[PDB]
Scaffold this active site. Structure first.
Site, PDB file in Angstrom:
ATOM      1  N   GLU A 245       4.095  -6.150  -3.756  1.00 42.80           N
ATOM      2  CA  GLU A 245       3.210  -5.030  -3.431  1.00 42.80           C
ATOM      3  C   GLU A 245       2.051  -4.937  -4.417  1.00 42.80           C
ATOM      4  OE1 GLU A 245       7.369  -3.247  -3.249  1.00 42.80           O
ATOM      5  OE2 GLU A 245       6.617  -5.287  -3.535  1.00 42.80           O
TER       6      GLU A 245
ATOM      7  N   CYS B 125       9.964  -0.634  -5.285  1.00 45.93           N
ATOM      8  CA  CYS B 125      10.561  -0.102  -6.500  1.00 45.93           C
ATOM      9  C   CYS B 125       9.676   1.005  -7.080  1.00 45.93           C
ATOM     10  CB  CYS B 125      10.756  -1.235  -7.507  1.00 45.93           C
ATOM     11  SG  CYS B 125       9.208  -1.748  -8.303  1.00 45.93           S
TER      12      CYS B 125
HETATM   13 ZN   LIG Z   1       8.148  -3.383  -7.130  1.00 42.48          ZN
END
Ligand SMILES: [Zn+2]
Ligand SMILES: [Zn+2]
Lengths: 157, 153
Positions: A54, A82
């Protein structure tokens, strides 16, 4: 359309782990159905623990579009972002997040217990505003299988 | 020493905002008493919203040490790290964080309310492991003053 871009993210995850760039994680940033960035985790290739799929996609898309906000773009993540990645998605002003597998699917094969309170709505201080979609159906099953498939591929190595 | 490296992170905050690289935020990563990285926010210079001072410092330290974990190092942040940066600090496995100004100091000058539960001890799914020190006394005075001093900058 969501199925198309989520499966592209999953294929990025497979490609990245196959060539050793990083773990089995992918991310695709799209602007009105045009792909702006298609990336996977680069932590190993870049020697950069922040180079998650990401974060890598955000960096690429912002450089391509010459701006630090991606407010007209959406991000497809093969796995639930995350805390670091969800924070980067927040900072980037992405308008929508679609993710494929829950974080538990990655923890199941030994990845760190490292989950974003603001994504799951469990924070006191950090709240999220952006639109979040947990995939269902075929796209979700395909995304969830990435981790057992990777563990099987590297079991005797 | 704690004061020395926190003051250097604040110095980076001032330098970066003065040359237009980014906001008034700095970070310093040290191995015992040697600076491994000294950085500030590069969001504007890099066209990269992830290039906060702490993330920039982590990337530079990892390149300098040729490895993705910094378990022997400590990080000094002029301001309370945000959720992104605190996540990055977790992943890099820095063993200690010292930070100068509470996030409320930046918010009071007009920065977004964007605060890491895991740093303040209120995370449910994210639990910090590393030792965290909020500066007091002169260190806190210096770090808080950054936002008043750079208001119109
Ligand atoms: Zn991450
Ligand atoms: Zn930050």
């Amino acid at each position: 359309s969501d199925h198309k871009f989520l499966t592209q993210a999953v294929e990025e995850a497979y490609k990245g782990v196959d060539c050793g760039d990083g773990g089995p994680f992918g991310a695709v940033i799209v602007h009105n159905n045009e792909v702006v960035a298609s990336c996977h985790n680069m932590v190993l290739k870049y020697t950069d623990p922040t180079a998650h799929a990401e974060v890598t996609a955000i960096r690429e898309a912002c450089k391509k579009l010459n701006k630090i906000e991606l407010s007209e773009c959406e991000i497809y993540a093969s796995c639930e972002p995350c805390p670091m990645c969800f924070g980067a998605i927040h900072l980037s002003r992405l308008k929508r997040l679609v993710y494929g597998a829950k974080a538990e699917a990655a923890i199941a094969i030994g990845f760190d217990d490292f989950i974003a309170d603001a994504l799951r709505g469990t924070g006191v201080y950090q709240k999220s505003s952006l639109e979040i979609k947990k995939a269902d159906g075929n796209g979700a099953a395909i995304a969830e299988q990435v981790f057992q498939n990777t563990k099987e591929k590297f079991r005797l190595y």
